[PDB]
């Protein structure tokens, strides 16, 4: 069958793209944003385990092997995801379709369908293969939707503006076609018969026609600008509103740049939604009318014009694909150069300490040379395209004048008719050229529409929640973990088996080493993530059946990584709460002990914090977070201050063993399980791992 | 006397720009970089103290006061520096120039010369003021250098290419002018007399002329592209090579984006070094020739075309400035929107925890609305400009045809001559339009050239070095800090008279609280910064008189902020030196116990650490840094006894006193002084502060 290559949308969806290509090869089309979450793709990328898991979840029979160079020559299944390393820098996933003889044809999600020699592939190939078969429970289907039809629904509230633009364009075209005959009237009638009195009247009439044309262009330009602004705002706000509701596994599996980069997709979608639609429905009629008029003037000259526009279209179509390949290479080289520059500027201390200035100069010079080479390749492509287009246009104009002079000599037309034809040409070739120039715009906009709208299909956090409860209002009680398991998207399990009960209204401390998983329990208690197996009970109630708003409102979490957003001190403290008294704010700031330096700051509780509280220090920003958490007035408080009622449960996460001696209960988390529990004295006397780490660290 | 308003090159140089404006007003012109470095401008901007310090350094007599609306009308020096709280969100500096009839005139470095009312100014004014006046030790002059001169001096080696481009352009212009008479030969001579064979001959000849013109354009385009790339690469590499040699106070005082934007400034400079010169020459000659030809064809039509181009130039010149202002506003609004989006995405967990999705959505919607409003103002400016230009061009074409028909009827011309005039108009209107269109390209290039070339005037780290005797070959010995004073820029002092002695070969440690300044001693020891008062001595000799190469080579510093570069493990471990053999790296990795995790990697000692060691985590990067430092073979090692030679001094910086008990000497750093020095037992005794922090910590 046809070789399907699904191109990537981001920099870290190689395995998802390969799995999508293989699924589409057998007749199963799905959005990339769903396969990306089935494979457990994250910032680091996809591993073969995720590919096998997702393929088995897609109905495929999946298997993973390590092969050798000679193993390739054997007969096996066609699709065959393979692992490569390009430039000896980063790993990558491709799809090796067929092996005729010594030639390996592969779908590369980053470039397209490419071919290597057997030696070259075996050099880049790492020996790992993912064998896929269409299982037994694999059902064909097409679970995607047309994104362009979806985004074309924004035009429905703008029908009046679209109609006004269409009418203005029609009037503009009619006036231009009418004004194209001024030179014909000049040469054939006024100049020939020396009509001085008429000349002025006809010239004034055509000047008035041109002024009306200018006014219509002004009006329709304003309308088009307003339409584009509206469509951009609508698409951007819809995308942002959906993104703000997605679960935390969406944000943890993607970079900030990936999420933000789709705000530039809105403009690309708007281009084909509005400008391409207007261009089609206007320039089609305009080109038809212009061609009819040109054929009325002269058949042979119209045929010459048709040949000219056909040659221009052929040249542009031929140069379309090479030009977009060079631009991508330039972007990649520029990204590499920018990364090198930023990384060398940030690490100037090390460079100066080790004397590696000449090395940095040479590396940057090499990267600049690479960027210049790519830029020259693209510039040469553009120069060749422009030279061919200019040859076609200029020779076509010369041949049109030549054949027009021939026809005038033969008596078929007149000179004024030839000049009027030269003007109506400007009213014929431009519409067809504009229609031809829509291919890159439409292709880019289709890619952007898929890239943006595949996220709008993702289920929101509230959608995934099961039925809630209208009788659980307070979260006070006992927090209990029943055989909780968790992994961060098809990776090594952070928690292997968790069993711990937190007494009601007490203070407890979970102890462990770096990477033990205490922060993972903190996140799991707040329903930022769900356990893959087990349960979390709060006062005899499942964590899943309690309202998400109540869970987020009655639980506070203060970590060493605080978040302050640009705004006044009071605005940061009143995050998410609108009607709050100022006395509560000052009381919370006093309890958090942030009431001193804030008053030391100018404007008191109005000090704007530039660049996420850059002026404030690390110690100060934590106190604002504590004040905010106290303002929340929660039932469970997880710290990484203490002035609340004794009924609230307090959880402490720390690697030190000294500040938590007075805690009621101490839970020791090692290797993802609660190895020991109880009070400090009991664990010290028990001679467990707590004793070992107390003797090693605190002696 | 004109009001001088120096504009900002960056975001944090408002006070430096204000002081430069005042100095230029008083007759002293200097570059913005020197004034910025005298004022102590850093990533947090500048304060008043820096302004008075630099003004006193610049020969001014200056003072800082806090005034009120009742004092803003008395007799005092008319040019002053005022503090504003613009938008109630950003503190900023403006220059007050004249108050009369209750109208405040201020030069704002970000906007220009503006005039506020008393109410608005007092609303934005803070009440603080800096009063300046030239003093006894004031010397006028112009210490600024023209940057276009040197950025065009880069064109000296490439003069042959420029000459080839010039010759190709003149040949192209001559061929086009010759081909512009095809329509005249058609209508006046070929069509009129029904000469068919001659029609074919002349048409073929003009086709050949056009083909030659296309070939010349191809050749010229290739040459221009290559010249532009060459000049871009030259400017970029010069800037980068100079930047890599600057002291560390250049990097602490600026952001990464500030240093990187000069790479775009390089292209901005080139666009006028290459584009503007060739444009001026070729288009001036072409415009003169085309004007002569048009005047030969007809004087009245030439005057009409001259009026057309005059009107176009007037319109473009009038519309130039508001377009720039609108573009600046749009860029500011885009920056604000991007900052809000990044902040909201990064802190999404806090938003979800506090349920502020609706508030964030509304704020982002408001910022998007602001961006769209700013984009429509520039869109309307371009629409108005295009409409006026189209009116001028179309009415001029209609009037040219009208007057040409009038002249043909009156016998002053012929129809073929009128058509030839219309064809030839492309060789007079286009060159003058291109020459007119150079105003935005040259001002932007001038700003970019000043921005980039003010850095190239800064002294490098080696230039500021003193006389270094070549007798010191090793840094083994006691390390003495005598009355060392230091401060980061013009801020509050960090070290207040440090006096200490570190013995030779002993393992000593520096303890204190966070932010005390322990890292500052390590940085000063490595000579990244120099003490404003006092001295640092290694083996008796002063640190300033020892070669920078030896200081940087024989002293190693490993901190928590380990930086790993994008490359193989061997490449990162061999930073700075390349003539190293693998057994040495193996020994260093074994000493730093980093060998195991490198071994259990895809490509041992060849694994590529993408995105600055993203594969590794905190714990392996530190081991890599330790191995690299051991490869460095230092005489002084600072950490936060692997191998060594038992006489290599080791200095440990920490705040958890548990791991320092075994250290030979412990220096307690409080309030910018080494308050207590001694062994763990001595300091833990009845000594004072050390006992307090020991009992508090654990």
């Amino acid at each position: 069958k046809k070789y399907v290559c699904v191109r990537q949308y981001d920099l870290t969806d190689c395995g998802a793209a390969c799995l999508s290509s293989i699924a589409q090869y057998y007749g199963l089309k799905m959005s990339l944003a769903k396969i990306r979450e089935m494979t457990g793709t994250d910032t680091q990328g996809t591993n073969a385990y995720g590919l096998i898991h997702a393929a088995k979840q897609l109905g495929f029979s999946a298997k993973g092997v390590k092969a050798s160079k000679e193993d390739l020559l054997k007969d096996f299944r066609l699709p065959a995801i393979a692992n490569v390393i390009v430039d000896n820098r980063l790993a990558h996933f491709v799809v090796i379709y067929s092996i005729k003889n010594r030639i390996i044809t592969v779908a590369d999600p980053g470039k397209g369908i490419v071919r290597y020699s057997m030696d070259d592939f075996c050099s880049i190939w790492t020996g790992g293969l993912v064998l896929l078969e269409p299982g037994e429970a694999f059902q064909k289907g097409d679970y995607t939707q047309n994104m362009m039809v979806k985004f074309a629904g924004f035009l429905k509230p703008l029908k009046k503006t679209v109609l006004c633009i269409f009418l203005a364009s029609l009037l503009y075209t009619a006036l231009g076609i009418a004004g194209s005959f001024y030179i014909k009237f000049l040469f054939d009638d006024l100049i020939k018969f020396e009509k001085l009195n008429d000349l002025h009247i006809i010239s004034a009439g055509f000047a008035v026609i041109f002024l009306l044309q200018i006014f219509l262009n002004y009006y329709r330009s304003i309308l088009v600008t307003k339409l584009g602004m509206s469509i951009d705002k609508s698409i951007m706000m819809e995308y942002y509103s959906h993104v703000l509701k997605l679960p935390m596994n969406f944000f943890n599996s993607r970079k900030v740049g990936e999420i933000i980069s789709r705000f530039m997709d809105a403009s690309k979608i708007r281009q084909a939604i509005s400008g391409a639609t207007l261009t089609i429905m206007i320039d089609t009629i305009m080109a038809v009318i212009g061609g009819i008029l040109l054929y009325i003037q002269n058949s042979s000259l119209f045929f010459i014009s048709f040949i000219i526009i056909l040659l221009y279209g052929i040249i542009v179509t031929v140069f379309n694909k090479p030009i977009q390949n060079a631009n991508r290479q330039i972007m990649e080289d520029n990204a590499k150069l920018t990364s090198a520059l930023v990384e060398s500027v940030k690490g100037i201390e090390t460079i100066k300490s080790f004397g590696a200035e000449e090395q940095t100069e040479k590396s940057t010079r090499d990267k600049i040379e690479t960027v210049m080479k790519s830029s020259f390749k693209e510039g040469m492509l553009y120069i060749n395209l422009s030279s061919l287009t200019g040859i076609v246009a200029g020779l076509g104009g010369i041949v049109i004048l030549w054949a027009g002079a021939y026809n005038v000599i033969k008596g078929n037309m007149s000179g004024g008719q030839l000049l009027a034809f030269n003007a109506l040409l400007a009213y014929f070739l431009t519409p067809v050229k504009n229609l031809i120039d829509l291919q890159p715009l439409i292709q880019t906009a289709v890619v952007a529409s898929n890239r943006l709208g595949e996220i709008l299909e993702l289920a929101t956090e509230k959608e995934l929640r099961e039925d809630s409860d209208d009788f659980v209002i307070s979260l006070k009680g006992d927090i209990e973990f029943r055989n909780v398991d968790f992994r961060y998207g098809l990776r090594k399990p952070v928690l292997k088996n968790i069993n711990l009960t937190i007494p009601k209204g007490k203070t407890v401390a979970i102890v462990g080493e770096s990477g033990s998983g205490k922060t993972t329990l903190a996140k799991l208690l707040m329903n930022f993530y769900s356990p893959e197996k087990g349960d979390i009970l709060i006062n005899g109630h499942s964590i899943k059946n309690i309202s998400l708003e109540l869970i987020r409102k009655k639980i506070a979490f203060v970590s060493q990584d605080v978040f302050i957003f640009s705004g006044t001190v009071k605005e940061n403290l009143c995050l998410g709460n609108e009607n709050v008294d100022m006395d509560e704010i000052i009381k919370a700031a006093k309890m958090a002990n942030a009431h001193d330096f804030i008053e030391k700051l100018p404007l008191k509780y109005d000090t704007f914090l530039n660049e996420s509280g850059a002026n404030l220090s690390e110690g100060q920003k934590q106190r604002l977070a504590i004040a905010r958490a106290l303002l929340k007035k929660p039932d469970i408080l997880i710290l990484d201050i203490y002035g609340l009622e004794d009924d609230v449960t307090v959880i402490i996460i720390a690697h030190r063993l000294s500040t938590i001696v007075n805690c009621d209960k101490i839970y020791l988390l090692k290797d993802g399980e609660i190895v020991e529990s109880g009070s400090h004295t009991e664990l010290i006397a028990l001679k467990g791992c707590y004793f070992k780490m107390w003797k090693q660290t605190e002696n | 006397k004109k009001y001088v308003c120096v504009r900002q090159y960056d975001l944090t140089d408002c006070g430096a720009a204000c002081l430069s404006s005042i100095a230029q007003y008083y007759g002293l012109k200097m570059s913005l970089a020197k004034i910025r470095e005298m004022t102590g401008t850093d990533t947090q901007g500048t304060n008043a103290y820096g302004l008075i310090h630099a003004a006193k350094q610049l020969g001014f007599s200056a003072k800082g006061v806090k005034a009120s609306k009742e004092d803003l009308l008395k007799d005092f020096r008319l040019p002053a520096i005022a503090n504003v709280i613009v938008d109630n969100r950003l503190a900023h500096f403006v220059v007050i120039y004249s108050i009369k009839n209750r109208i405040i005139t201020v030069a704002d470095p970000g906007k220009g010369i503006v005039r506020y009312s008393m109410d608005d100014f007092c609303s934005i004014w803070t009440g603080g003021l800096v009063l300046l006046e030239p003093g006894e030790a004031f010397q006028k002059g112009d210490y600024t250098q023209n940057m276009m001169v040197k950025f065009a001096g880069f064109l000296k080696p490439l003069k042959k290419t420029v000459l080839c481009i010039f010759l190709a352009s003149l040949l192209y212009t001559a061929l086009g002018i010759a081909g512009s008479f095809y329509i005249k030969f058609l209508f006046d001579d070929l069509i009129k007399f029904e000469k068919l064979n001659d029609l074919h001959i002349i048409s073929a000849g003009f086709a050949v002329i056009f083909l030659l013109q296309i070939f010349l354009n191809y050749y010229r385009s290739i040459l221009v592209t290559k010249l532009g790339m060459s000049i871009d690469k030259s400017i970029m590499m010069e800037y980068y090579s100079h930047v890599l040699k600057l002291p560390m106070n250049f990097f602490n005082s600026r952001k990464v984006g500030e240093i990187i934007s000069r790479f775009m400034d390089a292209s901005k400079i080139r666009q006028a070094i290459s584009g503007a010169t060739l444009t001026i020459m070729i288009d001036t000659i072409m415009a003169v020739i085309g004007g002569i030809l048009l005047y030969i064809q007809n004087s009245s039509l030439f005057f009409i075309s001259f009026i057309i181009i005059l009107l176009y130039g007037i319109i473009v010149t009038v519309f130039n400035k508001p377009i720039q202002n609108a573009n600046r506003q749009i860029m500011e609004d885009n920056a604000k929107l991007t900052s809000a989006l990044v902040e909201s995405v990064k802190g999404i967990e806090t938003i979800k925890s506090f349920g502020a999705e609706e508030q964030t959505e509304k704020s982002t919607r408001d910022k998007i609305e602001t961006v769209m409003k700013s984009s429509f103002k520039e869109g309307m400016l371009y629409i108005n400009l295009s409409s006026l230009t189209g009116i001028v061009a179309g009415l001029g074409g209609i009037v040219i045809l009208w007057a040409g028909a009038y002249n043909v009827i009156k016998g002053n011309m012929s129809g073929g001559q009128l058509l030839a005039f219309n064809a030839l108009l492309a060789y007079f209107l286009t060159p003058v339009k291109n020459l007119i269109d150079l105003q935005p390209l040259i001002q932007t290039a001038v700003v970019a050239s000043n921005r980039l070339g003010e850095i190239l005037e800064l002294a490098t780290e080696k230039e500021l070095r003193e006389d270094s005797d070549d007798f010191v070959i090793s840094l083994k010995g006691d390390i003495e800090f005598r009355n060392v004073d230091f401060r980061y820029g013009l801020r509050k002092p960090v070290l207040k008279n440090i006096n200490l002695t570190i013995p030779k070969g002993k393992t000593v440690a520096i303890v204190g609280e966070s932010g005390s300044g322990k890292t500052t001693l390590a940085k000063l020891l490595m000579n990244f910064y120099s003490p404003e008062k006092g001295d640092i001595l290694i083996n008796g000799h002063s640190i300033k008189n020892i070669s920078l190469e030896l200081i940087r080579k024989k002293i190693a510093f490993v901190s928590q902020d380990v930086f790993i570069f994008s490359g193989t493990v061997k490449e990162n471990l061999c930073l700075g030196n390349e003539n190293v053999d693998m057994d040495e790296i193996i020994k260093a990795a074994k000493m730093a116990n980093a060998h195991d995790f490198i071994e259990k990697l895809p490509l041992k000692y060849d694994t590529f650490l993408n995105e600055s060691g993203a594969n590794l985590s905190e714990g392996q990067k530190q081991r890599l840094a330790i191995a690299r430092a051991l490869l460095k073979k230092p005489d002084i090692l600072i950490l936060d006894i692997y191998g060594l030679e038992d006489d290599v001094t080791v200095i440990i910086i920490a705040h958890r006193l548990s791991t320092i008990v075994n250290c030979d000497k412990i220096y307690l750093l409080k309030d910018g002084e080494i308050v207590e020095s001694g062994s763990h037992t001595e300091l833990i005794a009845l000594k004072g502060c050390y006992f307090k922090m020991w009992k508090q910590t654990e």
Binding site: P602, N610, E611, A614 | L11, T12, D13, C14, G15, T41, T43, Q44, G45, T46, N47, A48, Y49, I52, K63, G64, V65, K66, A67, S68, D71, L72, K74, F76, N83, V84, L90, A91, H92, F93, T126, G127, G128, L129, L131, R491, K492
Partner: peptide, 18 residues
């Protein structure tokens, strides 16, 4: 002499630009 003279310590509190 318009206003109260700022002290050397309070001058550093009168900042601008970021």
């Amino acid at each position: 002499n318009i206003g109260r003279e700022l002290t050397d310590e309070e001058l550093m509190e009168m900042t601008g630009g970021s």
